[PDB]
Structures are given as structure tokens and as C-alpha cells.
């Protein structure tokens, strides 16, 4: 199927309590494989997946140098951003950056991404053509002008279409057992009276991979989306994910309600019923 590689970077200023805290992580699809934390003792990019551990010393040395260089550049960014927005010295602010690439089934480049946020809001993003920028406010226009003058998009595009896709392909091959796998959700529904006239119906999906899934409740075939409590898909901790959806229903009406599960690992979408 389709695959993605993404790097996520977070830097947080802590004025008069040190330099900014920088955390970087990398993922293939929903599987983490590396981390760096600026506060940790090792000062190294570290493996977080068994299949990346075989990479030799040039990978670890070069990735540690590259990630430390990403950290420095966010340290500069935090100063520059406080100037652009006329913000005071004291308060903590957050810069986030994400970049990476998607490949299709043939593992050829499909789409590339490179986006920044400041204090939780879109700041500037490379557009789908990898040649132009979306800037979310006037401060981010200042960045856009500087990045256009410096031909940043061309250097990014070459990375995203080339190196990004090469390394993704490599990881998909070396970590095939983990990365090219689909685990179909184990599903069931539970039933519990909340009183003598109502019951919670909760539709469960367990032990699945990748994390993308859809769980929906119908009542006589009609979607119950406003009445459904849907929780955030969550890690089990073993490489698989879980999710549930619940509705509170009048006791006696259970057989009108059906849960519907869609997931790439299922040969067909499932309908679970109370009869």
C-alpha cells in the first residue's frame, strides 16, 4: 500500500532556565524509529525500533550531527519569532516543524511536506507543488520573502523527492516484518446498564495496525454521529492500536443499533449487531 516517513521537531523556550528544550522523533507510518532529546545525557540520535539498530556508525554519527543542527536552527527561530510578534523575553513559546514524504504502492514519490507552527498555530508550509509557500499571517510573510530570496523550496524539493523516498524505501525493506504488515482489528461490543431505562453500547476495536480506522454507530441504518462518543485512537504499547465508540441508548432498543468497523486489514467492513 501507501507509505509515509515523517520527522517531527518540537522546541520550547524556557527563559532564564536554560536553552530551549528540543525533541525530535522520526516515524515510518505509525511506527517510531528514532528520537533525540536535548536534555538527555547521551546527546545522540537513538534507535526506537529494532530494525533501525542495524544501521552502522555513519548513520548514527551523521543523524546525530543533522539533528543537533536542526536544534540550533530552532533556537535561532525562537529569538526571531519573538521579534516578529513583539513578544516579551519572559514567556515560553513553542516552535514545531514537520517534514517528510509519501510513496504509493510502487514506492515512487507521491507527495512531499514541510510545515512549521508557532505556539500551536500554522506558521508557514510548503504547498503541494513543492515550489511555493502558504504563510498564515503577516509575520510568516516575512519568512516567505526570505525563503523565496534564498531559494529554500528548491533545496527542500530535492530532499523530499530524492533522499526522503530513498531512506523510506530502505526502511520498508529492512523493517518489512513490522512495517509491511497489517493487523486487522479484533472487534466486539459491550453492554452496560446506566440505569433501569438506559444502557451504554460501546463498540471496540483492538490490536490493529496501522492506526487509521473508522468506527461508527447506526440506528436503523442511520448515522448517530452527534450522539456518539468517539475516543482518540490510542497505542496499546506493543505496536498496535485500540479505539472505541459509544452511544447511550434506551433499554429495549439495542437491536436497532449496529456498530460498523472499517480498516485496511479487514477483507470486508464489519457490521456488529445485538441480535
Amino acid at each position: 500500500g501507501s507509505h509515509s516517513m515523517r520527522y517531527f521537531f518540537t522546541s520550547v523556550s524556557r527563559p532564564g532556565r536554560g536553552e530551549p528544550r528540543f525533541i525530535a522523533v522520526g516515524y515510518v507510518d505509525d511506527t517510531q524509529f528514532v528520537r533525540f532529546d536535548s536534555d538527555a545525557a547521551s546527546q545522540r540520535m537513538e534507535p526506537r525500533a529494532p530494525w533501525i539498530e542495524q544501521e552502522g556508525p555513519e548513520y548514527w554519527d551523521g543523524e546525530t550531527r543533522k539533528v543537533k543542527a536542526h536544534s540550533q536552527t530552532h533556537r535561532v527561530d525562537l529569538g526571531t519569532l519573538r521579534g516578529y510578534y513583539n513578544q516579551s523575553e519572559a514567556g515560553s513559546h513553542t516552535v514545531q516543524r514537520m517534514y517528510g514524504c509519501d510513496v504509493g504502492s510502487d514506492w515512487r514519490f507521491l507527495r512531499g511536506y514541510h510545515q512549521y507552527a508557532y505556539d500551536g498555530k500554522d506558521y508557514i508550509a510548503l504547498k503541494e507543488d513543492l515550489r511555493s509557500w502558504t504563510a498564515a499571517d503577516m509575520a510568516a510573510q516575512t519568512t516567505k520573502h526570505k525563503w523565496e530570496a534564498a531559494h529554500v523550496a528548491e533545496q527542500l524539493r530535492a530532499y523530499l523527492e530524492g533522499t526522503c523516498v530513498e531512506w523510506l524505501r530502505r526502511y520498508l525493506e529492512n523493517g518489512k516484518e513490522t512495517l509491511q504488515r497489517t493487523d486487522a482489528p479484533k472487534t466486539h461490543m459491550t453492554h452496560h446498564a446506566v440505569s433501569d431505562h438506559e444502557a451504554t453500547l460501546r463498540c471496540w476495536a483492538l490490536s490493529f495496525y496501522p492506526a487509521e480506522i473508522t468506527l461508527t454507530w447506526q440506528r436503523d441504518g442511520e448515522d448517530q454521529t452527534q450522539d456518539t462518543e468517539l475516543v482518540e485512537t490510542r497505542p496499546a504499547g506493543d505496536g498496535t492500536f485500540q479505539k472505541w465508540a459509544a452511544v447511550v441508548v434506551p433499554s429495549g432498543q439495542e437491536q436497532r443499533y449496529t456498530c460498523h468497523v472499517q480498516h485496511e486489514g479487514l477483507p470486508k467492513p464489519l457490521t456488529l449487531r445485538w441480535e
Binding site: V34, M45, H70, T73, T80, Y84, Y123, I124, W167
Partner: peptide, 6 residues
């Protein structure tokens, strides 16, 4: 594996 200031 990884690959600019604002």
C-alpha cells in the same frame, strides 16, 4: 536520513 531559519 534527516535533511534554514525563519
Amino acid at each position: 536520513x534527516l535533511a534554514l531559519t525563519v
